């Protein structure tokens, strides 16, 4: 027998089938729970208040679990055991808690804090009901790694990711108390022991290191500027990292050693490397605490001896004021510079190091990217460098569209990191000797045989297992004095990367993602639970998900947009691209040209050769004149042949008869396959008009610049099933031409374009032969710029076809064209000054 128990909060409600043998107890709680639960408001927007049925049943599990105690068997145990089993059968459809948590965030109007509360409740409940996470989860990722379809690498971040790194440790201690609580307490007694064992430790820990007291009571927690100091921030960032690793292990039912054996390798940016060697020694939950003690102890001594070697001194108020009122940060010992090359930065630091003495010089400390460096040194020195940089950069709201590409003043960003020591600098070298002595006095050695996976050294990208010397000594050297070459250390061939590090979305994960975009590597941020609207990297949920949402791969551009051959029944071979697959003919087109493609004789003749060609509206001034050209094109082409039409967007007069004509001719079924819109990109409302009304197969767009490409990508996102042909042309093209380079804009925009499977991506400007186009077809063109291969879907050929037999160009004009020598891509911009290769730039009306 069984009795329905209604537990509710306004509109939302849940029925629980409680057995009658223990119903009187479940009603006792139902009343007591209904007292603590507040009044139901509109939208449940207030705090400590459920927003979905799932949250409410959570709260109820949280309340029942608070009265229960795990030592002695109470009366309430048999209610917790059951109410939990109802949560599992209703809302966790086999999945893990985090997968539900995620599902409630995006669909319902749940806030992050409520979802964290829901996870705490469930996890607490599970543990205090004597039902631990013992069985191995069916997580898609760890299924795929067992089979061999995935290769996991763990990365650990470090300093200079967030100023509020402690909130991540506070969040772990709240939400996962029962899992990490034992670790965090052991780390707190280990640090407290190291303070009273070491001679002059208490002199550096002015406000103590009682982290437990700070986690319990947020009021007793010291100010951020003390927590940021490396003697605290070093070991606590290690603790945060090991806590995320534990959680990840304990919710997967793995031992550390099991989770370590699923990893192809580990590695860590800066002090992350200490954690990375720490996990690679782990085996069981019993011997996990010797690998933690070693990690925490190393980071404790690094943080102490480095702070004794270079303590942060009061900065002059004149420099603090100049930095704040010039939109920069607070001067720290590390200056990030974005969107400059490593040579370009090493120039500016070689100018600034010439004027300064030895003990004040700055060096490049982290190379996180091609164009993403970090310079370490004294904060006054880096403010120097920052004065030498602000005169060299353009304002971030300057318009450089009407300036040729090579004359444009280089624009970049430069912020100070939130870190209180100059890591990877000559300044910390004196500490090295002291650290190597504190590691042998506290019996902390990493042995090469005990390390079961490869841990990649941050300098040269080598394994630390193949080191002749001491591993500890090297790891210290890698943190304090050697630079971090991040691209060189992440040369491992993996499909998935787990960022354990602090900072979540601002951390090392997302940076590694930007470096490796288009190589078919997916980053998972193993610490933070959250949603990515782009979905380019994943969060904590993706580790524990058991459905197909757990093994999401990222697009490898070389494999996905590989050009192929195919043949039809008649045995004609075609180049198969996203474009050619649609139009059923070779992925080459003759774009609309006034006056080259105004001739209906040349449009028919190209259509009859079997190639897309746009009829140029630029040569027509009425619907009547165009209509009679179209009628002449049709007359000369074979049945089933089609052609396009080019309209000029900066001729409103020509659009206001052209668009109605295209609409009318398609309603009678004329073979107009597509419309290309030259000279600018239509607005969303106009583009939507053309797509939905004109009865076209696809729509060509010709973006001039970055903003125009972004405007094409927005048009595509609005009509996701309708093909858009993004004809990218550099300013080196014939006719009306932009100021833009051919390459640079595509390197920036290619990833964002390829997110949208309905954009077919054509490349024009400066092509005549198979020889020069093939690198764009196979994507090797982008390997010269140290980017992953970016294959293109099609080519357009303007200038090249102007001397064809069928073009109306007069014989003496054709001789005059054929006599022009031309110039390679790098010279083209000279046309703005003087005749370069027979060709010059002039201004229109």
């Amino acid at each position: 027998s069984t009795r329905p128990l209604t537990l509710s909060h306004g509109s939302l409600e849940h029925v629980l089938l409680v057995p009658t043998a223990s119903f009187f107890i479940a009603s006792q709680l139902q009343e007591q729970f209904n007292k603590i639960l507040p009044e139901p408001t509109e939208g449940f927007a207030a705090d400590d208040e459920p927003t979905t049925p799932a949250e409410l049943v959570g709260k109820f599990l949280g309340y029942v679990s608070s009265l229960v105690e795990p030592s002695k068997v109470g009366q309430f145990d048999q209610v917790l055991n059951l109410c939990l089993t109802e949560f599992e059968n209703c809302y966790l459809e086999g999945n893990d808690i985090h997968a539900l948590a995620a599902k409630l965030l995006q669909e319902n109007d749940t806030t992050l804090v409520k979802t964290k509360e829901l996870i705490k409740n469930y996890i607490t409940a599970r543990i205090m009901a004597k039902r631990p996470f013992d069985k191995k989860s069916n997580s898609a990722l760890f299924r795929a790694v067992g089979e061999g379809n995935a290769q996991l690498v763990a990365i650990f971040g470090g300093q200079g990711n967030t100023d509020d790194y402690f909130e991540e440790l506070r969040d772990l201690y709240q939400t996962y108390h029962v899992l990490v609580g034992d670790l965090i307490k052991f780390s707190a007694e280990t640090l407290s022991e190291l303070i009273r064992t070491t001679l002059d430790a208490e002199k550096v820990f002015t406000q103590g290191l009682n982290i437990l007291e700070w986690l319990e009571n947020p009021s007793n927690t010291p100010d951020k500027d003390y927590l940021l100091s490396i003697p605290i921030s070093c070991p606590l960032i290690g603790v945060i990292q090991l806590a995320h690793y534990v959680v990840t292990a304990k919710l997967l039912g793995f031992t550390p050693g099991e989770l370590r054996s699923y990893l192809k390798g580990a590695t860590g940016h800066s002090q992350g490397l200490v954690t990375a060697v720490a996990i690679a020694e782990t085996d069981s939950w019993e011997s996990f605490f010797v690998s933690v003690r070693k990690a925490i102890t190393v980071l404790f001594f690094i943080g102490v001896r480095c702070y004794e070697a270079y303590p942060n001194t009061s900065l002059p108020p004149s420099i603090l004021e100049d930095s704040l009122e010039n939109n920069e940060g607070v001067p720290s010992p590390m200056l990030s510079i974005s969107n400059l090359t490593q040579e370009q930065v090493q120039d500016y630091v070689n100018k600034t190091n010439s004027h300064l003495p030895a003990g004040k010089q700055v060096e490049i400390s982290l190379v996180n990217g091609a164009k993403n460096l970090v310079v370490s040194g004294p904060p006054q020195s880096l403010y120097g460098l920052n004065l030498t940089l602000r005169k060299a950069k353009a304002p971030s709201g300057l318009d450089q569209s009407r300036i040729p590409f090579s004359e444009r003043k280089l624009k970049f960003s430069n912020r100070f990191l939130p870190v209180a020591s100059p890591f990877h600098s000559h300044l910390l070298v004196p500490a090295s000797d002291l650290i190597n002595k504190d590691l042998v006095k506290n019996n902390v050695s990493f042995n090469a045989k005990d390390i079961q996976i490869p841990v990649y050294d941050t300098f040269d990208g080598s394994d630390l297992r193949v080191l002749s010397g001491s591993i500890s000594e090297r790891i210290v050297d890698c943190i304090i004095r050697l630079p971090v070459k991040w691209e060189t250390t992440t040369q491992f061939k993996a499909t998935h990367i787990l960022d354990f590090g602090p900072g979540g979305a601002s951390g090392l994960g997302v940076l590694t993602h930007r470096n490796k975009d288009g190589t078919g590597v997916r980053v998972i941020v193993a610490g933070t639970l959250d949603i990515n609207p782009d979905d380019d990297y994943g969060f904590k949920q993706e580790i524990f998900d058991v459905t197909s949402n757990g093994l999401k791969k990222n697009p490898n551009w070389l494999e996905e947009y590989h050009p192929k051959l195919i043949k039809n029944k008649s045995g004609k071979i075609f180049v198969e691209t996203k474009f050619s697959k649609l139009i059923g003919r070779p992925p080459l087109l003759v774009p609309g040209m006034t006056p080259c493609t105004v001739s209906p004789d040349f449009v028919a003749a190209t259509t009859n050769a079997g190639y897309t060609i746009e009829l140029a509206g630029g040569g027509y001034f009425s619907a009547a004149g165009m209509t009679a050209a179209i009628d002449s094109v049709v007359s000369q082409i074979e049945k089933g042949s089609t052609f396009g039409i080019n309209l000029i967007y900066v001729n409103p007069f020509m659009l206001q008869w052209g668009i109605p004509l295209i609409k009318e001719l398609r309603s009678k079924g004329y073979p107009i396959q597509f419309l290309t819109i030259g000279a600018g990109v239509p607005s969303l409302e106009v583009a939507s008009e053309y797509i939905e009304t004109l009865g076209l197969k696809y729509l060509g767009l010709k973006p001039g610049s970055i903003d125009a490409i972004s405007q094409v990508i927005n048009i595509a996102k609005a009509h996701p099933n309708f093909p858009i042909a993004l004809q990218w042309t550099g300013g080196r093209g014939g006719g009306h031409h932009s100021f833009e380079d051919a390459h640079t804009p595509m390197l920036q925009m290619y990833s964002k374009i390829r997110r949208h499977p309905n954009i077919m991506l054509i490349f024009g400007s400066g092509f005549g032969s198979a020889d020069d186009t093939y690198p764009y077809l196979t994507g090797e063109w982008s390997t010269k710029f140290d980017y992953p291969p970016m294959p293109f879907d099609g080519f357009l050929f303007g200038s090249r076809v102007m001397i064809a037999k069928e073009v109306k160009t007069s014989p003496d004009a054709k001789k005059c064209i054929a006599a022009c020598t031309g110039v390679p891509d790098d010279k083209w911009e000279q046309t703005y000054k003087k005749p370069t290769g027979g060709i010059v730039t002039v201004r229109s009306e």
């Binding site: 192929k564 051959l565 195919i566 043949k567 039809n568 029944k569 004609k572 071979i573 075609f574 180049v575 198969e576 050619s580 697959k581 649609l582 139009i583 059923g584 003919r585 070779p586 080459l588 003759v590 003749a605 190209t606 050769a609 079997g610 190639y611 049709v634 082409i637 049945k639 089933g640 089609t642 079924g669 004329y670 073979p671 197969k697 996701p720 093909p723 499977p757 309905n758 092509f767 005549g768 032969s769 198979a770 186009t773 093939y774 077809l777 196979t778 050929f797 090249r800 076809v801 102007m802 001397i803 064809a804 037999k805 069928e806 014989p811 054709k814 001789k815 054929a818 022009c820 031309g822």
Partner: protein, 130 residues
């Protein structure tokens, strides 16, 4: 690359296509035309069983319904149910096979010899006088 005057447009474009075909054969098909996959007809692909029976309902998705009717193989049924356009002389009108078989309540399509293009017969049946 503009050097040779009065080259026919076919010869320039074919020159470029046949150029790529020769490099793509050499690099990705070890110079062997036999390794190239064949289809009946190449085209009309959007960038995004022998004896079957399909009962349409009010909920039946158009796109799913035509993909099933079309089959897997590229042949006349594929064209028939997936070509959005057919040709009338030189004009391009809406495909009337996709209008006739447009799914609705009562319709029942039976496909026979689905695996042999030459002998396949699609037979739509509807309720006519009960």
């Amino acid at each position: 690359f503009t050097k040779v005057i009065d080259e026919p447009i076919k010869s320039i474009m074919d020159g470029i296509h046949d150029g790529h075909i020769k490099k793509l054969l050499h690099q990705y098909y070890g110079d062997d035309e036999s390794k190239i996959p064949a289809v009946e007809y190449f085209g009309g692909e959007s960038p995004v069983e022998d004896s079957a029976v399909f009962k349409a309902t009010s909920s039946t998705d158009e796109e799913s319904w035509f993909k099933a009717l079309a089959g897997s193989e590229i042949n006349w049924r594929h064209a028939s149910f997936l070509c959005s356009f057919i040709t009338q002389d030189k004009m391009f009108v809406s495909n009337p096979i996709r209008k006739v078989f447009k799914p609705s309540q009562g319709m029942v399509v039976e496909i026979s010899n689905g695996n042999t293009s030459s002998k396949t017969v699609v037979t739509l049946s509807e309720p006519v006088q009960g």
